[PDB]
Amino acid sequence: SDVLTVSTVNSQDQVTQKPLRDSVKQALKNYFAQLNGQDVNDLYELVLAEVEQPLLDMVMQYTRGNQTRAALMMGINRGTLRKKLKKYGMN
Amino acid sequence: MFEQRVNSDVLTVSTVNSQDQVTQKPLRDSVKQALKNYFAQLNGQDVNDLYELVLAEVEQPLLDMVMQYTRGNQTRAALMMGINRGTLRKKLKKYGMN
DNA sequence: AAATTTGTTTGCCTGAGCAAATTT
DNA sequence: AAATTTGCTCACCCCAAACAAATTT
């Protein structure tokens, strides 16, 4: 059903999958609890930078450095991918 | 007075370790693992949309939490996300969040 | 009734090329 | 020596702004 999942453990040491979206939700619930009405400036860039870094990181590992195959898997423009890599200084 | 809290530690998730001690670990790592599993469980065809896949999986909950936190308010929402109110409307429509 | 938000209009990623360089 | 990939140029979404209408303070 879901293709992006992570591994969880419960009290009874069973390992079970939960969707990544649930983890993201958890992280933000946390972030929000810790701040007390202190305003949030750029939450979108925050999350995005937090999520692109390991995305680029895993497809550059998977395509063994091949930016062309990487860009194809991701479904984005080769130039775009260059841009993103320069942005997080993985290059 | 102020201890450093780095970017990987701002958005975090509760993990359980080899000693049943609960610890906060980066959201980065959750994404990382979801992808490692998505790869290892891929026998073995091509992928053409990894980016939109991840992106939707991460936008949906970000949009959800922000709206809960602004009690439905789209102006405050778009303002704290740091995006134009119009595109916030666009994303919201795209995910059926109305 | 005044202030704010909504819903709606307006006007800063990509394919294709191409030579250099790298892998096959 | 061929094929592929890279680095680099070219020129089809996000944004502020505006405004009336709805809503919330």
Domains (range + CATH), chain A: 1-91 (1.10.10.60)
Residue A75: CB less than 7 A from any atom in strand D: no
B54, A4 contact by CB (below 8 A): yes
Residue A74: CB less than 7 A from any atom in strand D: no
Q: How far is CA B77 from CA A52, B63, B82, in A?
A: 22, 9, 8
A6, A23 contact by CB (below 8 A): yes
Closest CA to A81 of A45, A47, A57, A62: A57
| Residues of chain A with C-beta less than 8 angstroms from the C-beta of B28 | 50-51, 53-54
Residue B67: CB less than 7 A from any atom in strand C: no
Q: Which of A23, A40, A80 to mutate to test the interface with B (most CBs of B within 10 A)?
A: A23
Which residue has the closest alpha carbon to C5 C1'? B75
Residue A67: CB less than 7 A from any atom in strand D: yes
Closest CA to B15 of A40, A38, A30, A59: A30
A82, B60 contact by CB (below 8 A): no
Nearest CA in chain A to B42: A3
DSSP A76: S
Q: Which nucleotides in chain D have some atom under 7 angstroms from a protein Cβ? A: 4-10, 13-17
Q: Concatenate the DSSP letters of all residues of chain B into one string.
A: ------HHHHSEEEEE-TTS-EEEEEHHHHHHHHHHHHHHT--S---S-HHHHHHHHHHHHHHHHHHHHTTT-HHHHHHHHTS-HHHHHHHHHHTT--
B19 φ/ψ angles, rounded to the nearest 5 degrees: -140, 15
* Distance (Å, whole) CA B73 – CA A60: 39
Structure tokens at B98: 């109305």
Structure tokens at A80: 């775009």
| Amino acid at site B3 | E
- Quoted resolution (Å): 2.9
